[PDB]
């Protein structure tokens, strides 16, 4: 089976955050299955405990975790803490345009290898995801 990618963004993302999440998930599918694609596409049905166990099972199964961290979210932050504890390969994408500052706990978790945080402008997100996987692919290129 293809690689498993985990995409993580704020469930309270606004209209603009939502179009960016759809762009990121759509591009990630070129690299494998996006486990959270239906959640990104949508009492929460199934209830909070079920949701927590499902995202934990998907985080643990992931080959890579890609989080959009522009909007503050306890959920995105919690999933990044569980992902670092699972020693996963993590990429955070943050848009500095709003002038809001990314939490020091996320910027400060970066080690430039396994945990990376990249500032980006909305227009270049597809090109930056291609760059990230071209530098360290999940599947080897054909000859």
Site for a second copy in 25-54 (CB under 8 A): 43-44, 46-53
Q: Looking only at Cα atoms, what is the longest distance across the chain? A: 50
CA 41, 44, 48, 50 dihedral sign is: negative
CB of 142 to ligand A1IZW, least distance (A): 31
The answer to whether residue 89 forms part of the interface with a second copy (CB under 8 A) is no
**What does the block give as tokens for 25?**
């998930």
* Region of residue 56 (phi > 0: left; psi between -120 and 50: alpha; otherwise: beta): alpha
| Size of site (CB under 8 A) for a second copy | 43
CB of 53 to Cl ion, least distance (A): 13
The answer to whether residue 46 forms part of the interface with Cl ion (CB under 5 A) is yes
Closer of 57 and 124 to Cl ion (Cβ): 57
Of Cl ion, a second copy, ligand A1IZW, none, which one does residue 36 interact with (CB within 5 to 8 Å by kind)? ligand A1IZW
Candidate list 3, 18, 63, 110; residue touching a second copy; CB under 8 A:
110
Candidate list 40, 62, 76, 93; residue touching a second copy; CB under 8 A:
76
Q: Assign 3-class secondary structure to 95-107.
A: CHHHCCCCCHHHH
CA distance linking residue 44 with residue 75, whole number of Å:
14
């Amino acid at each position: 089976m293809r690689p498993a990618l985990y995409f993580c963004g704020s469930i309270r993302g606004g209209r603009e955050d939502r179009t960016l999440y759809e762009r990121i998930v759509s591009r990630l599918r070129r690299f494998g299955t996006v486990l959270t694609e239906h959640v990104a596409a949508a009492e929460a049905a199934g209830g909070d405990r079920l949701i927590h166990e499902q995202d934990l099972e998907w985080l643990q199964q992931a080959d890579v975790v890609v989080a959009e961290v522009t909007q503050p979210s306890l959920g995105v932050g919690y999933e990044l803490g569980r992902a670092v504890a699972f020693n996963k390969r993590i990429l955070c994408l943050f848009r500095p345009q709003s002038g809001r500052v990314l939490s020091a706990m996320i910027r400060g978790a970066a080690d430039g290898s396994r945990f990376q945080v990249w500032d980006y402008e909305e227009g270049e997100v597809e090109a930056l995801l291609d760059r990230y996987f071209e530098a360290d692919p999940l599947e080897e290129n054909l000859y």
